[PDB]
Structures are given as structure tokens and as C-alpha cells.
């Protein structure tokens with residue numbers, strides 16, 4: 001380093017600070033965008049440039065060429081977190097700023113384009129090793145593997161204590177991306193917020209709140225400008241419809257969300273998703289972290305775009 005500040009063209013320098021930023025089609029700029037976010041989010045001192053670059057390039061190598069659960073998603077989810085952390089400067093610990101951008105870059109490592117359900121029904125070996133949150137325990141496992149490669153220990157300077165704390169933040173953060181766990185997490189956070197028992201000094205409460213940030217970042221396609229939201233949904237459904245095909249090959253009617261013959265039901269399905277998952281997610285997040293409100297506003301804008309799709313106004 002250390003006088004070696006990463007800088008982005010003006011349009012990117014400004015728009016990267018905004019929640020609805022799209023990282024663009026230039027794959028070779030994504031590492032630099034991430035380093036930029038680490039430096040501003042954490043410090044130019046938090047990681048050794050050489051180690052961080054080697055870590056990033058090994059993480060990229062271990063995402064697959066699947067339509068949605070790919071390297072672009074990793075960097076997209078890390079950017080939403082960057083926007084949360086930067087809008088909530090003083091709420092997060094030094095270990096948290098470090099751990100969470102990494103947890104986001106790593107959160108779908110070695111994803112195969114298939115749900116936990118599909119793995120369980122296929123009887124994949126990963127389903128025997130990890131009975132619940134199957135892919136998420138895998139993703140955390142790949143994260144540790146890459147951290148243990150020569151020249152890849154970005155945490156090398158931390159004490160044995162802090163190293164164990166940061167790997168434990170990463171683990172909880174990655175596990176929280178199991179959407180099956182989100183519904184209960186958000187219900188508890190809602191009750192806590194509304195009986196005024198929420199306490200960010202309670203580690204167990206911080207864990208929940210970080211879990212909600214992870215869901216929020218992970219679903220952030222719904223918080224983009226409509227053309228990004230719409231074109232991202234196409235990639236999401238390309239994966240789901242492939243899984244649906246694979247379900248049919250095991251002799252199992254897929255759920256409609258995964259059935260490409262039920263394309264007509266997408267718009268009504270998106271309404272349910274925004275109502276049951278997305279809006280409640282961003283609403284509770286905004287309650288706990290008021291500056292995240294642009295995610296909720298952007299989400300509601302996208303619900304309204306799907307309602308126009310239904311009314312044939314597009």
C-alpha cells in the first residue's frame with residue numbers, strides 16, 4: 001500500500017453511495033469496486049492490499065457460471081451492505097465492518113443454482129453433511145477453506161480472540177441468508193422493537209439485527225430501479241425454472257415459482273413476495289435503522305410496478 005487509494009470514475013464515485021446502485025456489466029471493475037467499499041467502510045489499514053486481492057480473486061474463482069447465484073450477486077449484496085454501513089457510521093464495531101462486507105462477498109460461495117429443497121430431494125451428499133441450512137453451511141465452509149489458503153489470511157493481524165469473533169460474525173451472517181430463518185428472525189425483531197426491549201448492547205439482539213441486514217442485502221434486487229429489478233428477476237427465474245425441470249426429472253411436480261409452464265403466474269407471485277417477504281423485511285429494518293428507509297421506498301416503488309404489470313399497463 002499504503003498511499004494507494006482506489007478511485008472510481010465520477011459517476012460511479014457518486015452513485016456507489018446510493019442504495020439503488022447497479023455495479024454494471026464490466027466484470028473486471030467489480031474487484032476494484034469491492035476494495036473501494038472496504039477502504040471507505042473499514043479503512044485502507046483494515047486489510048493488506050496484496051492479501052485482500054488474492055482473497056477476492058479466489059472467492060470469484062469459487063462462484064459458478066449460474067444465471068443468478070454468481071459473482072455479480074456476491075458483489076451486488078456486498079454493495080447493499082456497504083450502503084447500510086455507510087448510512088449508519090457509528091452503530092457498528094470495527095470487527096463488524098471487517099466481517100460483514102466479507103460475509104456478503106462469500107455468502108453464496110460455490111452455489112450450484114439449486115435450493116436446499118432440491119439438494120434434499122436429490123439426496124445430494126451436502127444434504128447428509130448439513131441437515132438444515134444446507135447450502136449456507138457449505139458457503140461458510142468454502143469461506144473458511146479460502147481463508148486457510150497460503151497468502152489468503154486477510155485477518156492475520158487480529159488476535160486469536162478477535163479472529164474467532166470475526167469468523168463467528170461471518171458464520172451467523174451467512175447462515176442468516178437461509179430465507180427459511182428470516183420469517184422467525186423478523187417476527188422476534190418486530191415484537192422486540194414494539195415492546196421496546198430491543199437492545200443493541202445485547203449481543204443476541206445484534207446477531208438478529210445483522211441477520212435482518214443480511215436478508216435485506218440478499219434480496220436487494222427488489223430495491224433497484226425498475227429496469228434492474230425486472231432484468232434481475234429474469235436471471236432469478238432462469239435458475240428456478242432449471243430447478244423445476246430437475247424436479248420434473250426426479251418425478252416431482254415443482255412449485256409454480258419453479259415451473260416454466262406457469263410463467264403467466266409470475267406477476268401475481270411477485271405481489272405475494274413483496275407483501276409476505278420484501279416489504280416486511282425493509283419495514284422492520286427501517287424501524288431499527290432509520291437511514292435504510294430508501295430500500296423500503298424503492299421496494300414499494302417496485303411493488304407498484306408489478307401491480308401495473310398485472311393491470312396490463314406494462
Ligand SMILES: Cc1cccc(Oc2nc(N3CCN(c4ccccn4)CC3)nc3[nH]cnc23)c1
Nearest residue numbers: 221233236237256257262265266269270272273
Ligand atoms: C425478487 C424475486 C424474483 C423471483 C423469485 C424470488 O424468490 C421468491 N419468490 C417468491 N414469490 C415470487 C414469485 N412466485 C411465483 C409464483 C408463480 C409463478 C412465478 N413466480 C411465487 C412466490 N416466493 C419465494 N419463496 C422463496 N423465494 C421466493 C424473488
Ligand SMILES: [Mg+2]
Nearest residue numbers: 107108135177
Ligand atoms: Mg444463498
Ligand SMILES: [Zn+2]
Nearest residue numbers: 107108177218
Ligand atoms: Zn444470496
